[PDB]
Amino acid sequence: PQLPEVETIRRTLLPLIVGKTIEDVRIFWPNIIRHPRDSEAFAARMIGQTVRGLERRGKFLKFLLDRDALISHLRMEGRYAVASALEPLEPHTHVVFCFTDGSELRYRDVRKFGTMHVYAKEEADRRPPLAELGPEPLSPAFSPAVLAERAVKTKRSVKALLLDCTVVAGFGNIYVDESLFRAGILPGRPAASLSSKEIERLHEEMVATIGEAVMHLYVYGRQGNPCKRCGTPIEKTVVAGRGTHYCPRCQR
DNA sequence: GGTAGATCCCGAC
DNA sequence: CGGGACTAC
Ligand SMILES: [Zn+2]
């Protein structure tokens, strides 16, 4: 799920778990647990804590408990569900939080790609994976000025820049390509080559693109198909080590 | 330090 | 091979 979907999960999941107390934590794929390193310590420490809140930073979910925070990333295919302990688990369920009321928060992931970190609340923001995370794209902290400053200092492409979690939080591959199209900027352009005008335009489209989604596609996955603005076939290449989609007429 | 690379996964070509 | 977010040049 992308940032907008994660925000939706945050909003919808909260009332389903707030105020519930953890009675057990069952782990069927220990590698998901990244901290504490020992999955048995992870499970042991959460038992007895009550869920108090649920926040989002980038694409990370931060479950707030009594003493600890659980930081969770779903990557591409991870999913949470709240359901009864009396029913069979769905396929590819890797971690289950059992509540004293007989309900469960279950983490599924066909790809087994997600991660979980638990720390005392007060430590979470200064430890991985939240440490170094850039500003929210929808916050005033993410500004043309901030973007311009990172752009001038690097030799990387503008796409590589936008994908950098330290530059801006949780801006995924799809929104990078879409924003660059809407801004009229080629993804392979050196970040430092962007004029002041292009930076302002890019920031504007990044906010608009992600903002609209939080509340169709022009290029992503549309290779070989006509651009919706000019009719030129959308092309796909590899930039910054990822599938990259663009219109060679609209973007310069 | 800045940056590319290696790392984890497995359904689907 | 597709993605997102510790190691070594
Ligand atoms: Zn076009």
XYZ file of C-alpha atoms (C1' of nucleotides) and ligand atoms in Angstrom:
275
model
C 0.000 0.000 0.000
C 1.089 3.578 -0.758
C 1.026 6.561 1.597
C -2.638 7.434 0.998
C -3.680 3.817 1.604
C -1.553 3.678 4.763
C -3.312 6.785 6.040
C -6.633 5.051 5.328
C -5.446 1.992 7.242
C -4.389 4.217 10.131
C -7.799 5.879 10.243
C -9.839 2.685 9.923
C -7.712 0.369 12.074
C -7.525 2.649 15.131
C -11.090 2.249 16.424
C -10.867 -1.524 15.862
C -7.951 -1.908 18.296
C -7.823 1.120 20.595
C -8.217 0.194 24.258
C -7.558 -3.505 23.705
C -4.927 -5.290 25.804
C -2.391 -7.706 24.317
C -2.538 -11.177 25.862
C -0.290 -13.055 23.412
C 1.870 -12.406 20.366
C 2.359 -15.246 17.919
C 5.077 -15.185 15.304
C 5.198 -17.585 12.371
C 7.974 -15.859 10.442
C 10.537 -14.402 12.883
C 12.412 -12.497 10.154
C 9.600 -9.915 10.082
C 10.713 -8.864 13.574
C 13.656 -6.477 13.296
C 13.842 -5.159 16.867
C 14.305 -6.552 19.428
C 16.412 -8.878 17.279
C 15.024 -11.890 19.157
C 11.379 -12.470 18.205
C 10.740 -14.037 21.625
C 11.714 -10.761 23.311
C 9.469 -8.861 20.887
C 6.489 -11.031 21.838
C 7.255 -11.091 25.568
C 7.489 -7.312 25.982
C 4.195 -6.491 24.285
C 2.124 -8.843 26.441
C 0.047 -6.918 28.959
C 0.186 -3.609 27.098
C -2.933 -1.818 25.893
C -3.246 -0.127 22.499
C -3.556 3.640 23.009
C -3.120 5.169 19.568
C -2.109 4.731 15.945
C -0.097 7.261 13.976
C 1.479 7.364 10.535
C 4.875 8.572 9.417
C 5.488 8.224 5.710
C 4.392 4.666 4.929
C 5.160 3.510 8.492
C 2.402 2.795 10.999
C 3.237 3.612 14.610
C 1.105 1.674 17.080
C 1.249 3.425 20.456
C 0.932 1.131 23.470
C 1.390 1.789 27.198
C 5.174 1.867 27.289
C 6.203 0.781 23.792
C 5.621 1.817 20.198
C 5.331 -0.772 17.438
C 6.642 0.535 14.113
C 5.292 -1.431 11.150
C 5.894 -1.251 7.392
C 3.688 -3.259 5.010
C 5.820 -2.721 1.900
C 3.917 -3.627 -1.271
C 1.539 -6.392 -0.217
C 1.304 -6.466 3.597
C -2.146 -6.169 5.177
C -3.676 -5.869 8.657
C -7.003 -7.382 9.711
C -8.898 -7.538 13.008
C -10.786 -10.805 13.508
C -11.851 -13.482 15.991
C -9.365 -15.899 17.558
C -11.998 -18.604 16.975
C -11.691 -18.524 13.182
C -8.939 -20.020 10.986
C -6.170 -17.609 9.998
C -5.970 -16.426 6.400
C -3.090 -17.678 4.220
C 0.333 -16.056 4.690
C -0.361 -14.777 8.211
C 3.019 -14.111 9.814
C 2.332 -12.229 13.042
C -0.743 -12.201 15.269
C -1.456 -9.941 18.218
C -4.005 -11.626 20.488
C -6.194 -9.376 22.639
C -7.848 -10.274 25.969
C -11.276 -9.865 24.342
C -10.684 -12.825 22.036
C -10.036 -10.650 18.986
C -6.759 -10.466 17.062
C -4.781 -8.007 14.990
C -3.276 -10.079 12.193
C -0.457 -9.219 9.836
C -0.504 -10.991 6.449
C 1.996 -10.690 3.613
C 2.273 -13.020 0.624
C 5.718 -11.521 -0.037
C 6.904 -11.710 3.584
C 8.508 -8.336 2.967
C 7.209 -6.204 5.824
C 9.071 -5.217 8.978
C 8.273 -4.648 12.657
C 10.342 -2.753 15.247
C 9.396 -2.237 18.909
C 11.024 0.364 21.196
C 10.025 2.356 24.254
C 7.820 5.154 22.853
C 10.276 7.925 23.639
C 12.978 6.153 21.611
C 11.027 5.249 18.475
C 11.555 8.534 16.630
C 15.341 8.423 17.056
C 15.836 4.781 16.101
C 15.422 2.902 12.834
C 13.368 2.842 10.787
C 11.949 6.273 11.718
C 15.317 7.905 12.310
C 16.308 10.167 9.397
C 12.825 10.025 7.852
C 12.157 13.194 5.861
C 9.175 15.534 6.345
C 5.593 14.622 5.489
C 4.877 15.616 1.873
C 1.617 17.242 2.994
C 3.244 19.261 5.785
C 4.634 22.815 5.616
C 7.944 21.190 6.616
C 8.105 19.895 3.054
C 8.608 23.057 1.007
C 10.030 24.135 -2.355
C 12.956 25.556 -0.376
C 13.690 22.238 1.333
C 13.406 20.426 -1.988
C 15.609 22.971 -3.776
C 18.303 22.542 -1.119
C 18.505 18.762 -1.498
C 18.389 19.050 -5.289
C 21.387 21.363 -5.642
C 23.628 19.285 -3.378
C 23.333 15.979 -5.245
C 24.545 14.412 -8.498
C 21.567 12.040 -8.589
C 18.575 12.163 -10.918
C 15.458 14.003 -9.790
C 13.662 10.644 -9.550
C 16.381 9.209 -7.308
C 15.972 12.302 -5.145
C 12.210 11.979 -4.711
C 12.591 8.290 -3.833
C 14.939 9.179 -0.972
C 13.072 8.664 2.321
C 15.305 11.303 3.932
C 14.177 13.917 1.406
C 10.440 13.377 1.795
C 8.557 10.660 3.661
C 7.006 7.713 1.844
C 6.762 9.103 -1.680
C 6.430 5.884 -3.664
C 7.497 4.945 -7.191
C 4.016 5.493 -8.607
C 3.627 9.008 -7.196
C 7.150 9.983 -8.252
C 6.417 9.156 -11.914
C 2.969 10.759 -11.767
C 4.231 13.957 -10.116
C 7.117 14.289 -12.569
C 4.708 13.946 -15.482
C 2.342 16.534 -14.034
C 5.297 18.845 -13.455
C 6.566 18.288 -17.014
C 9.989 17.097 -15.870
C 11.900 14.067 -17.188
C 12.662 11.532 -14.412
C 16.275 11.144 -15.559
C 17.019 14.866 -15.306
C 19.832 15.608 -12.869
C 18.195 16.999 -9.722
C 20.645 19.905 -9.761
C 19.587 20.791 -13.313
C 16.108 21.824 -12.164
C 15.456 25.562 -12.319
C 13.840 27.403 -9.421
C 10.633 27.401 -11.466
C 10.779 23.641 -12.031
C 11.347 23.031 -8.318
C 8.289 25.083 -7.363
C 6.244 23.316 -10.024
C 7.462 19.886 -8.902
C 6.696 20.597 -5.248
C 3.250 21.831 -6.255
C 2.464 18.687 -8.235
C 3.891 16.376 -5.566
C 1.579 17.897 -2.975
C -1.389 17.877 -5.353
C -0.785 14.300 -6.470
C -0.425 12.826 -2.998
C -3.052 15.163 -1.537
C -5.719 14.200 -4.060
C -5.083 10.514 -3.370
C -5.275 10.964 0.409
C -8.702 12.599 0.113
C -6.484 7.926 -12.772
C -2.858 7.554 -13.831
C -1.114 9.540 -16.569
C 1.985 7.395 -17.003
C 2.527 4.664 -14.414
C 2.087 1.263 -16.046
C 0.793 2.926 -19.212
C 3.794 2.236 -21.450
C 2.874 1.775 -25.101
C -0.381 3.641 -24.508
C -1.170 7.217 -25.659
C -0.402 10.081 -23.293
C -3.705 11.466 -22.012
C -2.502 15.036 -22.602
C -0.724 14.821 -25.975
C -1.299 11.342 -27.423
C 2.401 10.458 -27.588
C 3.057 6.835 -26.556
C 4.173 6.554 -22.934
C 7.618 5.020 -22.592
C 9.206 2.953 -19.848
C 12.855 2.754 -18.833
C 14.958 2.025 -15.766
C 15.872 5.056 -13.667
C 17.231 4.912 -10.120
C 16.940 1.127 -10.378
C 13.169 1.129 -10.857
C 10.490 0.908 -13.530
C 10.128 4.466 -14.791
C 7.281 5.780 -16.913
C 7.139 9.080 -18.775
C 5.873 10.992 -21.793
C 8.831 12.144 -23.901
C 6.802 15.104 -25.241
C 5.142 16.496 -22.098
C 8.238 16.019 -19.934
C 11.504 17.836 -20.593
C 29.949 11.757 3.994
C 27.516 10.641 -0.565
C 26.324 7.006 -3.348
C 25.608 2.306 -5.522
C 25.181 -2.086 -4.263
C 23.542 -6.064 -1.620
C 19.743 -7.756 1.092
C 15.083 -9.786 1.860
C 10.542 -12.401 -0.712
C 7.878 -15.139 -4.027
C 3.827 -14.901 -7.715
C 4.197 -14.295 -12.262
C 5.795 -13.671 -16.553
C 12.562 -9.587 -11.844
C 8.948 -5.986 -9.074
C 9.131 -3.011 -5.136
C 10.980 -0.116 -0.029
C 14.142 0.935 3.232
C 22.737 -2.052 5.968
C 27.308 -2.535 3.938
C 31.211 -0.964 1.456
C 33.283 1.849 -2.781
Zn 2.314 13.806 -23.310
